[PDB]
Amino acid sequence: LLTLRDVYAQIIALRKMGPLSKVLQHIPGLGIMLPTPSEDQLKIGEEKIRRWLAALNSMTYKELENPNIIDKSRMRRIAEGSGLEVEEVRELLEWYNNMNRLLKMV
């Protein structure tokens, strides 16, 4: 049930219930339909879950703040350590900056 500390305390709570669906707990707005979130049980079928939650915990509690300092020698680092590929790491690194960005405009 400044941002990095919040990301972990949040993502960690995004597993002990599903992948849960509490996405509709702090949103007074309305939804769309039900035949759409059905593709959420698909990823659950596999013995695994997602690649994101992999290389996510495979990083220092300071390397997630400014992933910009990460180079070609740092991407392959959290790549083999998590089992993912260099490409699967980029999509993850280029996101940590988005959260800390779009948040500023909020």
Binding site: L14, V23, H26, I27, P28, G29, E39, D40, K43, R50, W52, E91, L92, W95, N98, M99, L102, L103, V106
Partner: peptide, 14 residues
């Protein structure tokens, strides 16, 4: 209000 509604809803894309 609307924060992660347009954030985490995009993590499943990749």
């Amino acid at each position: 209000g609307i924060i992660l509604v347009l954030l985490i809803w995009g993590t499943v894309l990749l």
